[PDB]
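question for whoever is on the cluster today: can someone run the full assembly for these? four chains, 1168 residues total. i dont have access anymore since they changed the login thing
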Amino acid sequence: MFEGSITALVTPFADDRIDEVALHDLVEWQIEEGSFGLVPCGTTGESPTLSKSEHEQVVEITIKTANGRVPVIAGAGSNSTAEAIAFVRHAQNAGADGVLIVSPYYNKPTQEGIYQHFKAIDAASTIPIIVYNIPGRSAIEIHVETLARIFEDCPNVKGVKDATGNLLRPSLERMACGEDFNLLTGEDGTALGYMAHGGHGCISVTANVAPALCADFQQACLNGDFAAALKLQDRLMPLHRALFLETNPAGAKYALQRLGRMRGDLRLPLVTISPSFQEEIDDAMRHAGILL
Amino acid sequence: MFEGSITALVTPFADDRIDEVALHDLVEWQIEEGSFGLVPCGTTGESPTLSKSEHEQVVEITIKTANGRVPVIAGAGSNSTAEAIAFVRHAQNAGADGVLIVSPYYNKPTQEGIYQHFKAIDAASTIPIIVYNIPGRSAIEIHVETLARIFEDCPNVKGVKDATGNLLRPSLERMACGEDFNLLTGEDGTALGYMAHGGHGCISVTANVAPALCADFQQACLNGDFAAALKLQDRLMPLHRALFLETNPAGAKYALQRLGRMRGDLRLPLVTISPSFQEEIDDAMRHAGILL
Amino acid sequence: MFEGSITALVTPFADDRIDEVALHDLVEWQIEEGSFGLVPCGTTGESPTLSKSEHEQVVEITIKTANGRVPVIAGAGSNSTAEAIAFVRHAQNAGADGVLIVSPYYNKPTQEGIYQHFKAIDAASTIPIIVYNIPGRSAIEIHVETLARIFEDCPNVKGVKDATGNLLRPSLERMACGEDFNLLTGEDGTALGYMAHGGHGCISVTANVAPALCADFQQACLNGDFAAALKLQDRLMPLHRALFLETNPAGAKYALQRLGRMRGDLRLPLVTISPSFQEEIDDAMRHAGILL
Amino acid sequence: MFEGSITALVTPFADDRIDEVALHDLVEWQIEEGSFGLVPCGTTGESPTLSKSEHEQVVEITIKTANGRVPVIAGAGSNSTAEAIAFVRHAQNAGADGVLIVSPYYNKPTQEGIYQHFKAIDAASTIPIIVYNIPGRSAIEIHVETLARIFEDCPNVKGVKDATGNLLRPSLERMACGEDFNLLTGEDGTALGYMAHGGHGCISVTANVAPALCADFQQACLNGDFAAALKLQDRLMPLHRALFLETNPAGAKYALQRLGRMRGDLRLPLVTISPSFQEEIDDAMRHAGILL
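^ ran it for u. tokens below:
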């Protein structure tokens, strides 16, 4: 199974193009810093504003740079089943260790619809699928029973990236699906409590800016050392909330730009985080020890 | 100014391709039945599962078939501002009378980002822009001030397709945006109250199956004859209700298939409406006198 | 049948006691201004902070002052069925024309529990019962079937005070519950659309400050003259909007205090409306011609 | 500070009266089983359907039976500030170790309102106050800053009973309020993750039926032994969800009645849990080892 701090990579842009060098450097630093894995082209990587070819470039750059040192789980979802499949076919042919498929957004399929969506994607897949359940953005939910049915009927579906904010979920999924079900969290601020519930790791936003600390936090939870994990939460909380002041990845890109690791370029409809929030992010990093 | 019953056309499929003959006969029948305008490739037209080439063919076939008889407002939204500009450019170049731009879905942009979204689109447009405010699918809202500011700074933005279900909106918008603001409803079952609050029409789902009755309903509303509009509500409510028993357009396609105007084919993640719901739709059409 | 502008009376306080002189003059002025009916001790009458003895005095003073000129529908709800029966018994024994029973709040009963709630109250009643469906405060809903079932099995249940903000409701209720079902709105800003969908009136908050204009609005609606009703909306919307800038009845009490009809005294946990909002209310009253 | 498994006592009824003997026995068994504390007259104890005198009897019976062996935190909230104070004055004069004050429900006070509510209650209090934040029932929220302001300005306010379902809360409160802030959870199913976040205990529903296991679970979390806690969660999850199948305390009373510890009598508008759910609760207890 996948575990620990798995970074949901921000996608650096420069001159309206993918910043190849900044991305390679981001991935390398991410690995030498301790990340257990990478997720290129997720929501944090601004997948919605990426072109088909850019998405492919980012997945491939990430796969070639990681060079098998850590798992690479390519974001390959869509609210169109046929397109999710095209993305999944590219990911696996590119050497990806797995894919992250979000629940169809906007068109609000029924549970049977969501079921058939993943069954079709599972069929065209040859790698691990992690179901990305985030009702807050997709405007639809994946019921525990539906999730359980998908896990049971789709050999490639191995787990979930839970972003419901409902902590009964990891426990209810441990019941519906066994202990062999891969439980990953999609939200940093509550990863502490998610791990206590039997979670395996977190596809992280904060790890983009504080990779080493997030790695230690995760490793601390994996070692069952929740006291250390708490102290780490104490150090990382200001950043966890500051990174979400407005809409992610606006804060993560400001943070990484403030660190001189990329330009802070965001693509419309997203815009640069508000200035007062930029200060809060600064003090948040100073508090974590990231910013001098 | 757009008004009356503007049909949000369902996109007929056959053998995994656009059913062009069915699409043509739908637009035609729709026009001879009295519809005030057509909206090809909206959410009811399953735009999310349409290839970019299919999107274009559907818009063009509708425009060519309409032959200037009724306005054609092309769906051209996207959660990528760059992509939205591409749909708008194509549409206006194809002869569309305007465009339906939904608020960016899933990526949850701030209010300033939404404002910049529409300002960037307005700069690339040469045709009327209607803002599709539907929080329940986009997982984001467009505050009245934001909407008023967009109307003020964007010369091509002429109105809204309100799908909030909050009837204070048209009143609040009449205040913030003058009476020259084009008010259209996105929901059939509450169009009656919307028109009473000063609405100008409705971009309809029900108009797909009962074009004649809906057009009359709107005409009553427009003539201020709300007594007749209510009588029509009594006749259409069962259908308005049944068409939404599961996620739209599953219900409308079942109905048009039952009426023999196309195949009920839907694309994943969407699935055919449940059988007990098919019966309710049958009874609603019989009640509306659409079926014998 | 209840109809028109039924004022949900604010409860005037002075020196931590009911201001009886102010209450009497409010009911009187309200009646000579044209209000169709009065609802003492509703949520706008701060029933939650009223002692049981104060509740009774307010109901009785309103009834005595009304002197049979307009119907008096007494607030008698509670999240305790036993307590609701006590309020209803007192009310009818005091000469109330009916009772306003809110859905049980906070304790979130199932639909069967709500049904039994109203069935137990209907058995103790001898006067008309109106069901106050307001999900936003009660944190619970009354499905249409449940509401229809209550209407069917409870001879004293005559209608609803809809405060869902879902305009499909009156239409769906017209279907499930015949046209003999008394439809009243709980929200002023959407009364216009409610009446167009077949509503019979509105249990108003705005009618407290502009009894004359609201009564006219309702009369227009009732006469099917929606053109005039819209014109009145234009005149009342600013006020409908300002009266709800913060939690009601904070806005209405500020307005009636500014008009010199009572003290602005509110009981904790409720506090006086913010100063910038007081100004917006002032401007709204000036716009509605209520203030010079 | 308060910690561990603090039971939110169900209130046994018999012949429409408080079942004095069943309650005494419940409290004794609760103590000999390992409970770290008792909360008489909370939501689980059906405070909404209790009379002023019954509430007082239950608090006093609980205080006399506990006989100082464990803390007794009397539920003393209301959406009326004056009444919360009356309840708090009785609790402390009765020998209570603290009180549980819910955020005002139904009347939706503003944050300043909620602030003044607790400031007034704090003033009339001489014992610890735990703020019960449960937006799901109260239909209002207590912002972190508001909570922090209340903690800082009210010497008697020592902590919170968090029932938001938002795990960022314990971490954000650890930041706003220090480590001296008493963090108690209001929801059993996510207590595991709450403790990982620095939680001190849980005012429990499940502890009513499985007091010893909930005690061990809590003690396990207090000892920082999250591996054991997980195994305990594994054993207790079926009961945690089964106890909330319908509306609490309907399942808790069925469970305790199934154990022969009281009659399952519930007060309207609440009703007995559905039969199929009674079976699920049975198997849930058999799974936990409670039921033979």
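summary bc i know u wont read the tokens: Chain C touches chain B at residues 165-168, 171-172, 174-175, 187, 189-190, 192-198, 224, 226-227, 229-230, 233-234, 237-238, 240-241 (CB under 8 Å). The longest helix of chain C spans residues 226-242.
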